[PDB]
Each structure stands twice: as structure tokens, then as C-alpha cells.
């Protein structure tokens, strides 16, 4: 005889007695066809009854489901595409799976998670895998603080052996309704435990988090998690795409993201605020959001082959804003930075504050005619802030018809470029025969009224102000200037850049910008003061010529040679 | 009771009537044992009959297969290791799977795809997964335009939630017979749709494409696809390993390749022709093929930790040819460039055209005695073209017994290195007491007849031509020269390189190369003019000594100091 | 009639006679419920029995298991959580799986592997997949030389089509008992085979190797393997975390590691000893172990986004030791280098030997008050060895209260920094009016007694020794010096660093360190001689002032400007 039973209730009611008998369950719920399987009668098992993988019959005899491979939620009575809250059945199935160090599968379908009780995934025991397709976890009615957390139950082993063997979460679209106070995923622990939680090597892959307060938030013990093909979008919090708060314990080692997409925040963004925290992003995209870094110290973010872009957006938000702290480093290596047109880009899209560093390697700096960064900076450049920028292998868009701009003040070719010395030192001021000509430093006379400017008012003959510095091939350059013509009898002058070899031979490839006749502060140089460093150049010379009878103020004479 | 039927045809013939009854199918095809399962009789179902997951019995009653997990092709009557065309059963199973947002599994075996109808995978609905092992999809008799295309049916959501949740293709060896007009995989769409297709985050993994016309071709909407462990080899088209044509719409954001192998093209290659297109290759290998970039503008390719090599090949093909356009950037960061011997490498293996940039970071430049790049360039260097090269952390093979060469013209240490000034300026020509010694610039007199040369024909005493430039530690250097001795009474002279500190102290370790006595254009410097920059060096001085009575032409005096 | 059999023994003993009949096996072992399935009776097949998928009944009739998808070890009688050796059943199941190009699954549980015969996985035919959870393979009683090896049976095809389609090993924790002579995983072949083995694209993922002699060792044909989420810890051999021995054939192309953790060796380490070998590590961590590179030539290791740290360890072991050979390159790009306090870090944590190169890109160099590298080097710097270091985008910890140090001798700003010229050249020695002041080079008089030193003993008025060099913004600097005051009448002097523009204007912010009055060799500069390069600086000047009546030796005047 090979007994078969049509439902879990009927299986449980029968007086099973023969040890080792195999009994078939057709379905967990009568008439559905899911959750069935083979069960072994055991009269001496100590296993806990759970109406799923261990059934205690009414006479006390245990029936042990024969499972090869993962546990499935339907083994505990979960149903696909049901209007009943599925979180209890998933939580019960997960508790069993974790207890036997086996992953839990959720069959592909839609599920509703209601109530307020989170699921804590223990990556040292079991992950939760949507199997396989577009598994939809509707948390729009969930009211708890977090839907999922991921945190090991151990301080060392066997987490050091087991976390890496299977993902913690895979294959799930998890979404809310942007209710204040409900977050999606907590990576680590809410509060500091008495002992550490060993979370290294834990993976979240092929999941989307959407429409939470914070979609993904790092907690304590957030270290060596890896994310592959994770999407985070449309969160409520200003920090809601991905938030790493300050003050985390036992956190920060190589948080890694491969081919993840952080996007369409509609006001939500990424913020890294924890000190001594190292994040690596490989082939990720950051779209219509800002990446803020305000850690007190020792944040290191590396973006290898990533894109930063504003697709379909009119927002002037920054792409990367390193705004506080010291010894914070942000690397952009390869990939792309793309700036679609908007009504006017009135602030720098990259910003690096004092004592911090933004490194650009092997990436092209974009240019667009809508660039208006001078509204923030006082002058036309791509990057703001008093930190440091470095370039290695950076390409400028030298053939862009709208222009090119320098990248940053810290890359200035010329000394006293902004008259910040408080005088005209480092510049040679050649009035020629014009003994009456006026050339004066003026405090608080530049574009913002808080910086110096050089006023040039030649009489009878023009005045030439110049500076020479060492350069060599290979390289490319762009210069911008702020100029304010007060009056002029025609073209007011020109700014020129030329190159010489070490013997004083003038090389081809000199460029020049005419000042014109329009009064008021304006940017000079966009599509003129740019080019490639000639092969054999050893010196670069800038010259500012102002004609007789013109009266011009100059500020922020910013050349960058990327080399 | 518990009814069972031995075939799909027998299941359909029975007059099922009891709503909710579960019925077992032993096998789809009688006697095979595959494709069976449990079916639920459903008297009110609106489901589409398909002889797979929805069966309409002879009396009109629907039976619904109870599926937990992915759909499998054998549920629709597909059979393994059959000579019958399996593409119709796979296409029918895929249409159903996609309609329910569930992936499709193909059981591991060999399959033949015939006919001319492609399968379009919609990554926002379902992927196709060979499960699990070496699944072989023989398309040698397929005559359609493409075997697989991958393109979303949606312009935004739910593609933005679903594409990342599962791969689009996994686990398949897909091959043709190199017939003209049959491509393997189309990434995106053939023609521009009235709305965009949201393809970001779609993955192809663990697949091989072989013996098609173009194995992998990008179409419109090709953006943020990721490829892992994908092999492409032995295509028919000259661009057949991976082709990105010009003019694609809505394409180019972070196309990403992890641990992919592009190889053994037997005349097929990679070509990137689309503008504003960004590709990232991590740990890939490019073997016995060329990577062409001819985008009109704004291509950015980053190769992190990749290998470029010619294993087992006698071909002189280039490894990387950035051949057209402007503002195109190609980065080689880490990894390796390996040049096995061939009968003579008569063109540069890397080429970067005017207005483009090739960045080398942390990689060793190889050298081999079969290098003969001067046949193309006119002079002995590793990289061709009028673009720019940068180096950061590049190692030269300074102990290579065959020699070492400079990398590129744009890294020239000395000014007027190729006599491109049209004169001998930047060089100090010291005739000593030799008042009748001849030293002259000759137009169109170098190796190619298109460049300048310097002729030195001293009388009574030798002539020394020198130049000094700034250098610093750390660094490594290699110089090559082209020399043509017309006549000489013995060794014609010597080229030397030495270093000084800023105070004029000569530092030990200078190097020198004899010119010898052989007539005709020859390369000087291979094993001689190379070394490390001494710690404390601040100047480098080159000197070319030509003896009395010799008559020698010099061209292309190319030194590179890698930092 | 759907016949059913309760065990493999009963299936074999029954007098089957009807050709083509499908019969059901409930379980391989009576009463277990695992390993059952459908079998097709064949009166014509004479296939060789294997008691798993091809079963020969006692009457000679063949019963052919109908399998869809992977082979499972329980189909051959393997049992979970058994005290019997499971290696024979896994090896028999694997041999069959490989023969049909199908992967082998091992159901999640614990297994004991005993005996001494390895399993050689052929990645061109079949992988072994623990499915799905924390699969535990206890090899504590295994006595063979290796547990698993991975090496293809083919020289070209179909390995070029198949290796990438599925992993070779996945999902397994494999552990020993640290018995001498028993290794865990051999990547490739033990000895040089008759033809090459085509191993490219083979993956090991989601596995842990623990407590072997060497946990992971490369053999011949080790090329283009990829490892994802692999852990290696607690090996017996000094090279036991990961060993690449010298002398391998057909090996070294792009061995790739993604998100792997190499850790807690308790005396075991990573060692790369093979020449012409290229390894790429992305988001890996190296914890409480050393990474040794002693390849004779042409090793290239790239670490992208990795961490090197000593968490919880008092050991002074190095992090990276490139100790031999030539033309070896090690890249650290992004990521972090973290140095938790210990009783005194008495050797350099990074070391690069002559003719080799260590490149640092976009990473912060740490500092700690426990740094005592001068005990090894003779002077206070972070990196040892006579090789070369480069920096690009490197951050120094300028706000670290304990100090900052220079990175390496090869980055010396000043010439004759260590008196290695054998004289005082490159330094300006201004005795002022002090005609009797003594300033002299002394051989074998520095900290180690094997290097030069400069002794300054001024009479009546102080002596100032200075040097000037070119610098530019942006940059950061740190200088250390070794000083030995023999006698002094008060503060012995000061070392100062200042900046000028190209016109000789002194820029604000110079720094200085007093020498004090303590006798004996000491480090000067830690928290004093450091800072940012002023924007507009073009020269840096160091000055060493020694007061009248003092008698002081100076050595190792090491400034580094990271530009």
C-alpha cells in the first residue's frame, strides 16, 4: 500500500503508526495542489511539529517531510496570489529553514506582507530566494519599522564558513507606499549587541527596493556585504535611496555593489555619514539623485565604471557632494558623467570640501551650453569646494561646440589666479609707454563682492599682463576668466595662451579670446581657451591684453592643464 | 479517487467535471516520463488553452497545471536529444512563462532550433535558463535574422522593478554554421519604437555564442545590460564577435562585461561604432581578435584587469585600434598585454587616432624581438596614431633580452624629436673646431619620405648634437632612434643618455649605443637606451656624437620616460 | 497500472519484462524517501549499470532513470547527515553526470569524505553544486593529497563552449583537520599533461575552504578561473591560504577573484611564486595574513577596492611583500589599508624589492602612533625595499594627531636625501660667518652604521643646510628625518619646509620641527613636517639649521610630495 492524503489536516488526523512508512501528501490546502510531498512516519523523532516539514499526528506520531534541497514556503501553507497576509507563513517557513541551515524558496507569484513584524534573515543560516521570476512582495500595508533585516546570530564561526555559501535575499521586488517610518531593508543591526555579529560575505542580489522611507539602511555590523543587480528607487526620505548613518559600530569594511542602479529618488538620495567606511561601486548608475558624503573622517568611496546622469530631469541637484569632514576620498574611475540640458546648471555638479579629495581617472568631463556654475562659484568651473581634485587620463570635450571649462581651483596652472594673494604678485604688468595707465588690485571687487579683482585702465597704449609656467606633453587644457568691461572704444582686448619649448621657440597651437564690447560680469574662454598641449612644449604663457581707453576688471583667471 | 493519466492526449480526452479535483499526468508524451505533473480541474477558468499549463478537455473543462517555480519546456512537449525542431515548443512555453512573469527552464540536453522565427525575450517578464549543465542549442539549420533578441515590452515600470530580478538568458551554448544573414543575439531592438524600451539591469550570463554572422549585436535601447561569463567566438562578420553599430537610439549607458572571453574570431572582431557609448570590461580576455573603436565621438571603454593576447596566432592584427572620431577614451587598467612571437610584428598593436586618448594604468608594456613596428610608423615604438597616450604606474620590461621600446610619440621627452618643426631648433649642434662640418635639416628625407631628417657629416673632428630636459624620480625610460649611415670610416658614433641633479652633478648610470657601420635605415636603442631614472635626478641629457668622416641621417629621436 | 517499488534493491530484484514500461522508485534506500523517480524499462539497452541512473535488474533488463535537470547524489544512494563515507556515492554520481554533460547536485546537509582518492571535476562536463544552503563537507578523516581538483579533459573544444555554462563548484563548506600533506582544492593539474587542458572560464563560487595544508593551490593549466564569494582561512602551510607555486605550465591568464575573503591564517598566507602570472582581486579582503609575491618575473597583481587589515591581531607581519624577481607589478586601487594598534610596528607593512613596482591609486595611506618602521629601514617611512612606488590620488592622514610619514625612498623630493652620493653634493651648506664650523660627510655613520650621514658642528654662529626643488599644486607632503644630537647647549636646531611661487614670493604656511636636546638617533617630523601644497606654489625649500655649539648627525632626509 502507498497511502495518500488530500490535505495537511487529513494527513494529521490519521492514526499513522508504522515507522519508515512513506506517505504522500497531495496538497497542503485541500484542492490547491501546492505544498504536497512525501512524509516518513517516525515514532521516535524529537522534531518540533510545525504543520509544514514536521507534522505531529493526532495520536502523537511524527511525520517528517522528505526534503531534498531548499524549504519552500508553500510547504507551510503559503499560497500564491492570495489576499491573505503571507508574512506569517513565510516567517514560519523561514524559522524552520534557518534552524536546519537550509535556504527558503518563495514560489514566483505576488504576496502581501501586512502587520508590523519584521523578518530577520540570519545569513549564517538561511536566505530567502524568490524562485524564479518576477516575485512581487507588496508591503504597502505593512506598518512596522523595517520589513527585512539581515544580521548573523554568531560572532565568528560558523558565520565565517557559511555566510558566503548562499545569498541572504535574491529575486524579490519589495515595495511599500512611502509611509513615513517604514523602511525596506536594514543591513546589520538596529542597536549595538553585547557581542559582534559576523556579517561578512553576505549577499543581496537581484532585488528591487521601492517606495519605502529609507529603502536600504546600514546598521551596526554592516561589513563586507555584497549587492549584485540591486535596484533602489523612489524613497520618501531625503536619504532614502541608500543611507549609512553616523556612529555605526563594527562597520565599514568593503561594502560592495556590482551593477546596481540607484535612481529616480523624486527627492531621495544616497548619504554616507559614517566615518572609517569604505564602499566600492562597480558598473553602477546614479540617476536623478545626489551622492552625499558628510562623514567626519576616513570615508573612501570608489566608483569604477559607473554613470552619473540626470535623464529626463530638469533638476540642478549635484551628482556628488562631499560636504564635510576630513580625509574623505571619492574616486571616479572610468565610466561616464553625463549632463543632459536643463534650464541652467547654476551650481557645480561635483563638490569636494576642505581637507577631502575627489580623484578622476580615465573619464571624460562633460560640457554643455546650459552650464552656469559661476552663479554658485563666482567663476566658470565644473567642480566646487575647497578640497583637492586630481586627474589622471581625463579627457576634456575639446570639440564640443558649446565650449569646455576648467575642472577645479586646485588644478590652477597659474599662481595668484584669483588675486587671493591680496596683490598682483606673480603677474608681470607691462604698461609699455603708458605711464598714465592704471593697473590696480581691488579688494572685494570680483563677481561676488568678496574676492579680489585686477582693474586695468590703459591710457594711450595698451597694457599686457602675463605669466609663464612649466608644462609638458601629453596634456589638454581649458581656461575660463571672469571679465567686467566698464567701457571700451571697440574690442576691449584679448586673453591668449601660447606654448614655448625650453629654448624659447614659440610652438603652433596658440589660442585667444576677444573680450568684445558687452559690459558687466561675463565668462570668457568657453569655446576659445582650450586645446591640446603641443608635443615638445615646455612652457605655457598666458597674456591678458587690454586696449588703450578700455577699462576692464579681471577675476578668477583659472586655467587647468589635465596631464 | 487520485486519478492519473499516461499522456497529455489521454488527459484531454477524459470528461473531467469536478471543480478542484487534482489529477496527475504521468508524462506529456506517452511513455517518456517528462512533462508530467498535477493538474487542477477548473470549471470557471478563463485561461488560454495551450496543451502545456492550461489543458482544455474534450468537454470544454479547463485543467490548470499546478506549477510552483519556473515553467519548463517539457511541460509543453519539448523533448531532450531529439532531431525534431524544438524551437516551437520552447517559443510556446516562453510565451506562457512571460505572460505570468515566470522564468522558463530548458532541461539540460541537446536541442535543434530550425525555421526562421526568432525568440524575443522580454526581460521585464521572463528569462530562458538552461538547467543545469552544458545545454546545447544547435541553430545550424536556423535561417532567421536573429536567434534571440532581448528587449522589454515597457517604457518604464514594471521594467524598472523586474528586469534585475532574474537573468534574461543563462546556461546555453548557442551556435550556428556561419551562414550569412543569421545573427546570434540582438541586445535591444532592430528599429526605433514609438516609445523607448526600458532594458536596464538585464543580464545574459553563462552563455556561449559561436559561429553566427554577428554573434552579439547591439540594437536600439541597448543600455545597462550586464554579461557574466559570456563567450563569443568564431563569427563570420569582420565585426562579428561583438558589434555596436552607429546611430543607435536610447543606448550606451554602462554596457558591462564581467569575466567574458572574446576570442578566436578567425577574421571576426569587436567594433564599437556608436557615439556616446560607455562599455566596461572587468577580467575579460580578448584573444586573436582586434577591438576597434570608430565612434564619431564620446566612446568610453574601460578594461579593468583584462588580457590582450595572440595565443597560437601568427597574425599581425592590432589588439586595440581607436581609429576615428574625437573624444574617444580607452582605458587599460591592470591586467596584461602579451605578445607571443610571430614572423614579424610590422604594425603597432595599439593605435589611437587624432583627438582620442588611450590610458595605460598599472600594466606592463611587453617587448619581443619580432617587433617591427617601424614598417608602419617609420620608427620603433609600441603605439601608433596621432592621439594621446597617458601612463600611470606602467612598467617597462627593462631586463628583456630582446630590448625595450618607447610607447608613443605623445610621450616624447625631447622637443622637435621628429624634426617636425621643419628645422633643427631645440637641439644644440656643437661642431667643435669643425668649421666645414655639415649639419642640415632635410625635408621629406626620413624613413618614409614624408618627414624631416637631420644629416650630420663632420669634417676633421666629430659633431655632438644634444638636448637637456627636466625629469624626476621615480621613472623608467626607453629611447629609440632611426639612423641611416651613408658612409663611415669605422663606428659612426654613439647616442648617449645621462642624468644630472638640479645642481649639475652628473649621476652614475648613463647609457650609450654605438651606431656601428651598417648602411641603410636601422633602429638604434633597443637593448642600450633604457633604464631606471636615478633617485635625485632632475635633468636628462641626450647626446648624438657623429665621428669625423661619417655621413649619417637621423630621424625620430623618441625617448619616453614613464613618470 | 503504474508500478511502484520501495527501494533500489526491490527494483533490481523484480522480474521486469514489459519493454518501455514506466515504473516509479519511491526511494533508493528503503524507508528514506530520497533518490526516487521514474525509470523506463528497456529490453534492448545493454548499457552498463551504475545503480543510479542506469540500473541492471537481476534478470538483465535495463531500467533507465528519467531525469530532467541536474543529477542528484541521492540518486546513487548518497544519504544526508550519515556517518558513512559519502565520497564514493558522490564520485559515482559525478562520473555519470560528467558523462552526460549535466551538473551534479548534493542536497543540503552534512557529509563525510573519507579515504584518499580525490574527485577531479571536469569543468567542461559537469560541476558539483551544494543545493541549497549551508552544505558541509567534512574531510577531517580524508588522507589523500587533494580533496578536489578541477581540470578539463579537453585541449580546445567543447571546453571553449562549455566551461562557462555552469560553475565547477558552488555552495560548499569544505574543511579538514590541518593534517600535513592534505590540500583542499587544486586549481588545474598536478603534473604537466600530454596536451594542454582548456580551463578558461571555469568558476568556483560560494565555497569555503578551511583547515587544510594548502586550502587552495594552483596547478598547471591554471588560467581564467574566476572565484566569487570564496572564503579561505586557517590553513597549516605558511603558504596555505592561496598558493601559486613556481614553474607552472600554461598558466597565469587573468585569475580572477570577486568579493573573496582570505583571512585568519594563524600562520598561513598567500604566496604568488609563478612567473608571467596575472591575478585580479575585486572587493576582496586580506585579513591577518601576508600577500607574498616572489615570482622570478612578470607577476601582475591588481587589487581593486580591497581591504588589507590586522583586525584583532598583535602581529607585525607585512600586508604585501614583493620580495624577489624583476618586472613584478602590484596595484592597490581604491579600497583601504587599515593598521590597528599593536605593541610596535617594527617593519614596513608594504615592501617592494629591486626592479619591481608597487602602485597606489586612490587610497589613503594610514598612520598610527605605534609605527616603528625605522627599526627595519633605518628611517621612518611606510614602505620598504629598493623597488619603485608610484602614487596617483593618494591621501595622507594630515589631521592624524599621531603624525604622518613619507611613503617611500623612490618618491624622495630632494636629491642626495640619504647621502648616498658619498658626499654632501646637492645641498647648499651655508656656514655664514662661521669659518671654523665643521660640516662633513661621514661614511657608515648613520642609524644602521652602514649608510652615510652629515655631521654639523658649528662654531660661534649657526649653519644652515638647504635644498630647493620644483613642486606644483595640487599635492600633500610629509617628511621624516633621522637625527642624532651628540651634544648641544640648548635646542639644537630646526628643520623647516617652505614654499615659493616661480617669482620668489614666499607663500604662507611654512612648517618646522625643533630638534630639542635629547641625544641618540631619533625620528624628526612626524606631526610637524606635513601639510598641503599651497595653490600657486612652484618651489619647495627645506632648511636644516644647527645652532652654534651643537654637534649633530643627520641621515635619511626623506620628503615625499604626493601629487
The residues with which C479 forms a beta bridge, in sequence order, are: C559
Q: What would the grid cell of residue C80 be?
A: 544526508
B336 CB neighbours in chain C (<8 A) are: 253-254, 278, 300
Q: Answer yes or no: is C423 within a domain.
A: no
Residues A458 and A545 in one domain: yes
Contact A229 B226 (CB under 8 A): yes
Contact A307 B2 (CB under 8 A): no
Q: Does any CB of chain A come closer than 8 Å to the CB of residue B469?
A: yes
Q: Does any CB of chain C come closer than 8 Å to the CB of residue B265?
A: no
Beta pairing, strands B476-487 & B438-442:
unpaired
Q: Answer yes or no: is B118 within a domain.
A: no
Q: Could you give the strand order of the β-sheet that contains B336-337, starting from the edge strand earlier in sequence?
A: B110-112, B135-138, B172-175, B208-210, B231-233, B261-263, B285-287, B307-309, B336-337
Q: What would the grid cell of residue A460 be?
A: 594711450
Phi-psi region of A52 (alpha: psi -120 to 50; beta: other; left: phi over 0): alpha
The whole-angstrom distance between residue B407's C-alpha and the CA centroid of its chain comes to 21
Chain A closest-CA separation from residue C15 CA (Å): 20
Contacts of C among chains (3+ CB pairs under 8 A): A, B
Residue with cell 606602467: B394
Query: Which residue in B241, B166, B255, B245 sits closest to B209, CA to CA?
Result: B241
Which resolution, in Å, applies to this structure?
A: 1.4
Cβ(A351)–Cβ(A386) below 8 Å: no
Query: Interior CA angle at B168 toward B163 and B171, to 5°?
Result: 145
Q: Does any CB of chain C come closer than 8 Å to the CB of residue A511?
A: no
B36 CB neighbours in chain A (<8 A) are: none
Q: Does any CB of chain C come closer than 8 Å to the CB of residue B70?
A: no
How many other C-beta atoms lie within 10 A of the C-beta of residue C27?
Answer: 23
Q: How far apart are CA B386 and CA B379, in angstroms?
A: 14
In sequence order, the 6+-apart residues with CB closer than 8 A to the CB of C449 are none
Q: Does any CB of chain C come closer than 8 Å to the CB of residue B130?
A: yes
Contact B20 A27 (CB under 8 A): no
Residues C209 and C77 in one domain: yes
Q: Answer yes or no: is C479 within a domain.
A: yes
Return the half-sphere exposure (C-beta side, CA atoms, 13 A cut-off) of residue B22.
20
Q: What would the grid cell of residue A84 be?
A: 491573505
Q: Does any CB of chain C come closer than 8 Å to the CB of residue A122?
A: no
Q: Answer yes or no: is B84 within a domain.
A: no
In sequence order, the 6+-apart residues with CB closer than 8 A to the CB of B176 are B139, B140, B142, B147, B182, B184, B210, B211, B212, B213
Q: Does any CB of chain C come closer than 8 Å to the CB of residue B32?
A: yes
Residues A157 and A55 in one domain: no
Q: How far apart are CA C503 and CA C507, in angstroms?
A: 11
Contact B327 A134 (CB under 8 A): no
Q: What would the grid cell of residue C539 be?
A: 618651489
Contact C69 B132 (CB under 8 A): yes
Give the nearest chain B residue to C203 (CA atoms): B229
In the stretch 145-204 of chain C, residues with CB closer than 8 A to chain B read: 158, 160-162, 164-166, 200-201, 203
Residue with cell 607552472: C248
Q: What would the grid cell of residue C51 be?
A: 545503480
Reduced to 3 states (helix: H, G, I; strand: E, B; else coil), residue B2 is: coil
Residues C225 and C339 in one domain: no
Counting the structural domains of chain A, the total is 4
Q: How many residues comprise chain C?
A: 563
In sequence order, the 6+-apart residues with CB closer than 8 A to the CB of B416 are A501, A536, B423, B424, B425, B426, B427
The residue among B259, B415, B424 with the most chain A CBs within 10 A of its CB, best to mutate, is: B415
Contacts of B among chains (3+ CB pairs under 8 A): A, C
Residues A199 and A340 in one domain: no
Query: Interior CA angle at A201 toward A197 and A207, to 5°?
Result: 105
Interchain CB contacts (distance < 8 Å): B and C: 226
Chain B closest-CA separation from residue A164 CA (Å): 19
Contact B535 C412 (CB under 8 A): yes
**Domain endpoint, select from C225, C255, C285:** C255
The residue among A129, A535, A539, A562 with the most chain B CBs within 10 A of its CB, best to mutate, is: A535
Q: Answer yes or no: is A253 within a domain.
A: no
Chain B closest-CA separation from residue A108 CA (Å): 6
The residues with which C540 forms a beta bridge, in sequence order, are: C469, C499
Residues A397 and A470 in one domain: no
Residues A366 and A311 in one domain: yes
Closest partner residue to C162 (CB to CB) among B27, B173, B532 is B173
Contact C392 B397 (CB under 8 A): no
Q: How far apart are CA C124 and CA C199, in angstroms?
A: 8
B208 CB neighbours in chain C (<8 A) are: 160-162, 164-165
Chain B closest-CA separation from residue A419 CA (Å): 29
Give the nearest chain B residue to A108 (CA atoms): B69
B404 CB neighbours in chain C (<8 A) are: none
Residues C81 and C106 in one domain: yes
Contact C208 A389 (CB under 8 A): no
Chain B closest-CA separation from residue A230 CA (Å): 7
Contact A409 C536 (CB under 8 A): no
Residues A47 and A101 in one domain: no
Cβ-based burial of B58 (10 A; exposed 0-12, middle 13-18, buried ≥19) = exposed
Reduced to 3 states (helix: H, G, I; strand: E, B; else coil), residue C510 is: strand
Residues A102 and A213 in one domain: yes
Q: How far apart are CA A534 and CA A476, in angstroms?
A: 9
Determined by X-ray
Q: Does any CB of chain A come closer than 8 Å to the CB of residue C280?
A: no
Residues C521 and C495 in one domain: yes
Cβ(A366)–Cβ(A339) below 8 Å: yes
Q: How far apart are CA B561 and CA C359, in angstroms?
A: 17
Give the nearest chain B residue to A174 (CA atoms): B161
A93 CB neighbours in chain B (<8 A) are: none
In sequence order, the 6+-apart residues with CB closer than 8 A to the CB of C465 are C424, C427, C428, C429, C430, C439, C454, C456, C543, C544, C546, C554
**Domain endpoint, select from C354, C376, C411:** C411
How many other C-beta atoms lie within 10 A of the C-beta of residue C18?
Answer: 12
The whole-angstrom distance between residue B230's C-alpha and the CA centroid of its chain comes to 13
Q: Answer yes or no: is C270 within a domain.
A: no
How many other C-beta atoms lie within 10 A of the C-beta of residue A250?
Answer: 20
Interchain CB contacts (distance < 8 Å): A and C: 227
Q: Does any CB of chain A come closer than 8 Å to the CB of residue B429?
A: no
C206 CB neighbours in chain A (<8 A) are: 164-166
Give the nearest chain A residue to C107 (CA atoms): A69
B297 CB neighbours in chain A (<8 A) are: 399
Query: Which residue in C79, C32, C8 sits closest to A21, CA to CA?
Result: C32
Chain C closest-CA separation from residue A284 CA (Å): 14
Residues C518 and C553 in one domain: yes
C259 CB neighbours in chain A (<8 A) are: 201, 203, 224, 226, 256
Q: What is the CATH number of the domain that holds B449?
A: 2.60.120.260
Closest partner residue to B206 (CB to CB) among C166, C333, C416 is C166
Q: Answer yes or no: is B413 within a domain.
A: no
Q: Answer yes or no: is A268 within a domain.
A: no
Q: What would the grid cell of residue A358 be?
A: 575627489
Give the nearest chain B residue to A80 (CA atoms): B68
Q: What would the grid cell of residue B517 be?
A: 657601420
Query: Which residue in B309, B349, B337 sits closest to C300, CA to CA?
Result: B337
How far, in Å, are B261, C174, C254 from residue B286 at the CA level? 6, 34, 11
In sequence order, the 6+-apart residues with CB closer than 8 A to the CB of C393 are A329, A331, A357, A359, A361, A390, A392, C361, C362
For C97, the domain range is 71-255
Q: 3-state secondary structure string, C366-427?
A: CCCCCECCHHHHCCCCCEECCCEEEEECCEECCCCCCCCCCCCHHHECCCCCCCCCCCCCCC
Q: Does any CB of chain A come closer than 8 Å to the CB of residue C265?
A: no
How far, in Å, are A495, A523, C381, C482 from residue C479 at the CA level? 40, 41, 9, 10
Residue with cell 509611509: A179
**Domain endpoint, select from B30, B65, B100:** B65
Q: Does any CB of chain B come closer than 8 Å to the CB of residue C416?
A: yes
| Beta-strand runs (E) in B116-266 | 119-121, 128-131, 135-138, 146-150, 169-170, 172-175, 183-187, 203-205, 208-210, 216-218, 226-228, 231-233, 242-244, 255-258, 261-263
In sequence order, the 6+-apart residues with CB closer than 8 A to the CB of A449 are none
The residue among B283, B359, B401 with the most chain C CBs within 10 A of its CB, best to mutate, is: B283
Amino acid at each position: 500500500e502507498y497511502p495518500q492524503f488530500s490535505s495537511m489536516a487529513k494527513l494529521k488526523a490519521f492514526p499513522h503508526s508504522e515507522d519508515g512508512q512513506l506517505v504522500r501528501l497531495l496538497s497542503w490546502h485541500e484542492g490547491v495542489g501546492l505544498g504536497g510531498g512525501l512524509f516518513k512516519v517516525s515514532t521516535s523523532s524529537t522534531a518540533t511539529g510545525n504543520d509544514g516539514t514536521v507534522v505531529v499526528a493526532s495520536n502523537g506520531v511524527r511525520l517528517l517531510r522528505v526534503v531534498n534541497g531548499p524549504i519552500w514556503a508553500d510547504m507551510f501553507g503559503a499560497l500564491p496570489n492570495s489576499d491573505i497576509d503571507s508574512m506569517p507563513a513565510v516567517a514560519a517557513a523561514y524559522a524552520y529553514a534557518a534552524s536546519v541551515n537550509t535556504d527558503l524558496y518563495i514560489g514566483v507569484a505576488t504576496y502581501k506582507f501586512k502587520g508590523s513584524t519584521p523578518i530577520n534573515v540570519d545569513p549564517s543560516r538561511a536566505g530567502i530566494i524568490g524562485y524564479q521570476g518576477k516575485v512581487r512582495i507588496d508591503c504597502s500595508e505593512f506598518t512596522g519599522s523595517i520589513v527585512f533585516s539581515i544580521n548573523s546570530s554568531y560572532s565568528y564561526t560558523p558565520a565565517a564558513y557559511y555566510n558566503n555559501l548562499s545569498p541572504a535575499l535574491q529575486g524579490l521586488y519589495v515595495f511599500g507606499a512611502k509611509t513615513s517610518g517604514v523602511d525596506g531593508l536594514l543591513v546589520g543591526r538596529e542597536t549595538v549587541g553585547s557581542d559582534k555579529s559576523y556579517n561578512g560575505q553576505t549577499e543581496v542580489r537581484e532585488c528591487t527596493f521601492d517606495k519605502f522611507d529609507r529603502n536600504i539602511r546600514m546598521g551596526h555590523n554592516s561589513w563586507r556585504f555584497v549587492f549584485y543587480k540591486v535596484n533602489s528607487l523612489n524613497a520618501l526620505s531625503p536619504n532614502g535611496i541608500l543611507y549609512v548613518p553616523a556612529g555605526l559600530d563594527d562597520s565599514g569594511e568593503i561594502l560592495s555593489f556590482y551593477h546596481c542602479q540607484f535612481f529616480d529618488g523624486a527627492g531621495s538620495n544616497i548619504r554616507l555619514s559614517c566615518s572609517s567606511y569604505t564602499m566600492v561601486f562597480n558598473t553602477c548608475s546614479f540617476l536623478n539623485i545626489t551622492f552625499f558624503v558628510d562623514s567626519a573622517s576616513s570615508a573612501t568611496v570608489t566608483c569604477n565604471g559607473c554613470n552619473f546622469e540626470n535623464p529626463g530631469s530638469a533638476s540642478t541637484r549635484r551628482y556628488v557632494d562631499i560636504s564635510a569632514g576630513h580625509t574623505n576620498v571619492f574616486n571616479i574611475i572610468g565610466g561616464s558623467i553625463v549632463t543632459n540640458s536643463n534650464p541652467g546648471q547654476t551650481q557645480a555638479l561635483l563638490y569636494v570640501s576642505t581637507d577631502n579629495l575627489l580623484n578622476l581617472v580615465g573619464v571624460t568631463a562633460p560640457y554643455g551650453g546650459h552650464y552656469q556654475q559661476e552663479q554658485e562659484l563666482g567663476y566658470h568651473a565644473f567642480i566646487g569646494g575647497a578640497g583637492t581634485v586630481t586627474t589622471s587620463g581625463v579627457m576634456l570635450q575639446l570639440r564640443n561646440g558649446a565650449g569646455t571649462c576648467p575642472l577645479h581651483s586646485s588644478l590652477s596652472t597659474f599662481s595668484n589666479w584669483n588675486f587671493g594673494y591680496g596683490n598682483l604678485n606673480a603677474w608681470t604688468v607691462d604698461k609699455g609707454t603708458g605711464t598714465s595707465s592704471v593697473v590696480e588690485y581691488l579688494a572685494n571687487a570680483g563677481p561676488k563682492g568678496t574676492e579680489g579683482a585686477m582693474r586695468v585702465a590703459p591710457v594711450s597704449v595698451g597694457t599686457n599682463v602675463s605669466q609663464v609656467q612649466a608644462v609638458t606633453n601629453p596634456g589638454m587644457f581649458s581656461m575660463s576668466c571672469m571679465v567686467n568691461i566698464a567701457t571700451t572704444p571697440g574690442n576691449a582686448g584679448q586673453v591668449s595662451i601660447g606654448f614655448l619649448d625650453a629654448a624659447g621657440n614659440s610652438l603652433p597651437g596658440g589660442v585667444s579670446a576677444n573680450l568684445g564690447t558687452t559690459t558687466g560680469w561675463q565668462v570668457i574662454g568657453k569655446n576659445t581657451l582650450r586645446g591640446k598641449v603641443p608635443i615638445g612644449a615646455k612652457q605655457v604663457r598666458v597674456n591678458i591684453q587690454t586696449v588703450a581707453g578700455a577699462d576692464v576688471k579681471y577675476a578668477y583667471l583659472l586655467c587647468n592643464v589635465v596631464k
